[PDB]
C-alpha cells in the first residue's frame, strides 16, 4: 500500500489546492537531499519498489473518483485506476515495465497503452497542443469525469488524452514548480480557466534541463544559460540557480550530491 493523498475539486479553494500540492511534494521526496536549496527526488537506481510510487485520489462534485499513480523519481503520472480497471502509459524500459505491476494489483482489468505519457504524444491524440487546452478547477473537474468514464466505455481516446494533459499539468507540473502551482492558485482564485501561457509551457519543457544544469553547476552559475519565456512570451536567459529558487520546487536526480 503506497501513500494516498486525497483532493476534491468540489468546493476547491486556493488554500485546499495549495495544501494538496504541498502534501504531494512531501510524499515525493524526504527533502534529505537538497542542492542549492532545491530538493532532489529519490535516485531511481537502487530504489526499492515498495517506495517507488505515491497515489493521488481525485474526486469531484459529481462524486466520481479516480486514482492517479505518480513515480517518485520524476513526479510524473504513470497510470491510474478507475473502478475495476487500471491503465498505464507504455513503459520505456523493462525495469519500468516491472515496477508498474506493483500498482493496483486487485483490479479486475489491467491495460497498458501503446503510447507514453509525454506531451508530444498526448497532444497528437487529444488533437490539441497544451497552449490550446484550458486549465483550472473546471477543467480538472471535467478531466476527472472523462477519466472515470473511460473505464465504462463512455470516453473516447482524444478526450482521455486531453484529460491526462490537464491532470499532469495541475498535479505533476505544479508539484515540480512553485511557479506553476502559483498560476493554478490564480485560476482558482478568480474562478477562471485558461490555457497555460508561454512561461508555463517552457518551464514544463525545461524541467529535465534545469535539473541537470542546477546539479552540474559550478558554484551556482550555469555553464550554458537556459532560455525561458515570460508570461507574454518574451525571452530571457537564466545564468544562475539563485533566480530559480522561487520557481522550481523539485529536481530529478542527475548525480551524486557533491
Amino acid at each position, epitope marked *: 500500500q503506497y501513500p494516498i493523498i486525497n483532493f476534491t475539486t468540489a468546493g476547491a479553494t486556493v488554500q485546499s489546492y495549495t495544501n494538496f500540492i504541498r502534501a504531494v511534494r512531501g510524499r515525493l521526496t524526504t527533502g534529505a537531499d537538497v542542492r542549492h536549496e532545491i530538493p532532489v527526488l529519490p535516485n531511481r537506481v537502487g530504489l526499492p519498489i515498495n517506495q517507488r510510487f505515491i497515489l493521488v485520489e481525485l474526486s469531484n462534485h459529481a462524486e466520481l473518483s479516480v486514482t492517479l499513480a505518480l513515480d517518485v523519481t520524476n513526479a510524473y503520472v504513470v497510470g491510474y485506476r478507475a473502478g475495476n*480497471s487500471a491503465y498505464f502509459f*507504455h513503459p520505456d524500459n523493462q525495469e519500468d515495465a516491472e515496477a508498474i505491476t506493483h500498482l493496483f494489483t486487485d*483490479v*479486475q*482489468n*489491467r*491495460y*497498458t*497503452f*501503446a*503510447f507514453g505519457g509525454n506531451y508530444d504524444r498526448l497532444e497528437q491524440l487529444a488533437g490539441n497542443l497544451r497552449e490550446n487546452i484550458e486549465l483550472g478547477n473546471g477543467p480538472l473537474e471535467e478531466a476527472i469525469s472523462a477519466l472515470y468514464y473511460y473505464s465504462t*466505455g463512455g470516453t473516447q*481516446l482524444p478526450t482521455l488524452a486531453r484529460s491526462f494533459i490537464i491532470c499532469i499539468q495541475m498535479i505533476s507540473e505544479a508539484a515540480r514548480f512553485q511557479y506553476i502551482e502559483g498560476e493554478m492558485r490564480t485560476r482558482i482564485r478568480y474562478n477562471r480557466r485558461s490555457a497555460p501561457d508561454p512561461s508555463v509551457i517552457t518551464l514544463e519543457n525545461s524541467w529535465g534541463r534545469l535539473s541537470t544544469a542546477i546539479q552540474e553547476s559550478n558554484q551556482g552559475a550555469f555553464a550554458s544559460p537556459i532560455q525561458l519565456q515570460r508570461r507574454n512570451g518574451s525571452k530571457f536567459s537564466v545564468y544562475d540557480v539563485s533566480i530559480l529558487i522561487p520557481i522550481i520546487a523539485l529536481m530529478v536526480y542527475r548525480c551524486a550530491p557533491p
Partner: nanobody
Amino acid sequence: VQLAETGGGLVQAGGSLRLSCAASGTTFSKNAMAWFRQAKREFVAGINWNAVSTNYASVKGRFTVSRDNAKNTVYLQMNSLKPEDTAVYYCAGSSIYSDISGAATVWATSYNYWGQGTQVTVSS
C-alpha cells in the same frame, strides 16, 4: 488500418495450419494482438506488444501465437486440429493497448481493428 491474412481452408485432423496476418498503417510493434473464432465469436489466443506475454482459451497445448514486429505480422500456429476447431478465424488488434491483462483480454471489445475472417474447416 489494413490487414492481410494468409492460411485457412480444409485440413484433416491431427494436422495443422498456420494463419498469418500482416497489419498497417499502425504501430504494430506497440499493439496487442489476438485471434478470435466464430460459429457461435470467442477468444482463441492473444499476445502483447513485446511477445513476452500470451494467453490461450480449449486450445491450450495445441495452438501457439507468434508475431514478428519487423514484418508487422502476427501468427497462429494450430496443431492437432479437431473438428470442433472448424470456425471462421479473425485476427484482431488494438492500436490503443500494448498489453491487455485480466478479464478484458478476451473481450472482442478490447480490440479496435479486425481482419476479415478465414474459414478453417477440419474434416473427420
